[PDB]
Amino acid sequence: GRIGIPRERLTNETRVAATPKTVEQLLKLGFTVAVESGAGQLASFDDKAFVQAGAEIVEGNSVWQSEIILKVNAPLDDEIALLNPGTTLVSFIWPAQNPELMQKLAERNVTVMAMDSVPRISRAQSLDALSSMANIAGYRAIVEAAHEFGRFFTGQITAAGKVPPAKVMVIGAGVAGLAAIGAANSLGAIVRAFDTRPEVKEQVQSMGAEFLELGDGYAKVMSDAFIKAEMELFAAQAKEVDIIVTTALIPGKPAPKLITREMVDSMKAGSVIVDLAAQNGGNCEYTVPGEIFTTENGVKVIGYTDLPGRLPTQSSQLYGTNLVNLLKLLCKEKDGNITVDFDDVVIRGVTVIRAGEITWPAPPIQVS
């Protein structure tokens, strides 16, 4: 029952699937652990920190001689061949967006658990890698914004006068949005947030932010009238806020253009936009994914797509913990053995390949 933690080989990836702390937890579940030399380096975990935790350090491709492989990103083409039959791989996969990856992994005769496919039910929250990375992203977004911003975020009285607080608008109050509201409010900004779902109002307000206000709900938010009013709201806000964080991103779909060139052009010089939808084209029309773009009117549009990789220690610890929590479901006894029980809707949801046969997608959850 050996778990292998490979070094992440996707260029510029800084995260690792286990930390010294998560390795201790993995051993308490009866597994042994091998970590590939250098795997945690960019996340500030040296080989010897892993050895202190009770892992064995291995070089080269011998980490792939393991019953279980825990990774962040999916095996590259040249890593798929190193998966041996009967191995359980746990990583991000994105099966819906990667049919060819699925076929390649299936031929290897492994069991694959995609961390993007954890069911969004209450009991799976300790396993939800998407929420873990989103929460880090929202915090990191405000750090990135403070870095690029040329003014105090924090209102204060100095001898040379009273400085006002920065004004921050956050579009989308899902997990990333809320984290951004939280970090912004801690820095003493006047925070404002918009979300199409009225249910989140009370949550947004408890964090200290203003909830912005403008045939089922779905039709409503899709209608020309609502979309016109929403664009008007954003145009007006753009004129008075210093920082905008946009988070409206659905996996696999192009991101909606909520912040147009014209809105950004209306902004005060030195303002910052952090576009957390950059990996799907961005919520902002000026966004160049992977980069900061500066407009003619002096606005910095931040479009990095690796915010969690920019908090690599935190992301590795939280993601690693998500994996521990999945393995707690897989290994209820002492004991180092994995049981893929499809009667557990969380397991069923996450398991996208089982012994060489594609089991994705799972059915709608319908429980008695």
Added chain:
Amino acid sequence: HHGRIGIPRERLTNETRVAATPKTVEQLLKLGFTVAVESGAGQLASFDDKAFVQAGAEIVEGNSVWQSEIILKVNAPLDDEIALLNPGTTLVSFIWPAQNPELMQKLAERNVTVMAMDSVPRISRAQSLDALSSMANIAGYRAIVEAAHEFGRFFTGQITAAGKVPPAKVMVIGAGVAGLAAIGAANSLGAIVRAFDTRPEVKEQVQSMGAEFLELDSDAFIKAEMELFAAQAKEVDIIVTTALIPGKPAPKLITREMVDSMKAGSVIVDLAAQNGGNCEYTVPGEIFTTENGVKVIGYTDLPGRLPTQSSQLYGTNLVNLLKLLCKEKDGNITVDFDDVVIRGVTVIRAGEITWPAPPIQVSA
């Protein structure tokens, strides 16, 4: 023109600040002056020509800015700028007369008056003019912004579904203006802050910010001070060090061995870098990453990395000096050497060197 203030574009390599903003321009006109800003002077600080024009300034090209009765700058004029200073002009900028006798001589020969913003006496009624404090305040804030950007973990403690994350631990060395601003920024990010200062009178300030005022236990004092830092280096994630006296080599307070003992991924922001740094690993102008994975931030331009704020506060410092110099609000400068504040700041008066000012009793 008489009563015209010229705001030149800064020429110093990589300078992003400007000596006036649209808001200070509004204040300057309220004092009876007119204002010419050299085109682009505010660009790097996010003040475009149009914002100055909207505030009431006139935009001028290159040299025209020097045809003003008053010139406000950040950095001292370069040789080719000095030659464009006309007799009777009043120049306000950082000057650093001790470090620059040659410059003092060249300005004197132009028969100008010079107010050195580094020479504001450290008495309480001059706080609103103290450009050194404005900049130190900015640097402490920005030091924490740089630390958070480079740090690979949450500063802020947090309960998550995937675990409870403790807050970052921050040690600030020196609780003068910059140290206190660092404390404040770190607090805003939810960090546990500890601070050390040799002056016991800052204890209540530090404790009032919810920070721990570290205690000890001349060669006995230094050794116990180094033992505190060595012990704290093993526990904290971020060290901000601020022990700097203008014109003097910075004491090495954090040694290579101390940094070598820290948790990997830790960050040091060394605000004494411009005088060699308090950290032995510091490389002024750069981040140096140690073999054990600690980032040592040695930037010497923290205020230039917050240029909009730096310009605003410094520009206000200049307004407040002109409020003293222009009591009638009529666009006329009157230098009154009975006021110790003006006597201190005035380093050349109409061609005559007046620095150093007679000895004075002060603060800190």
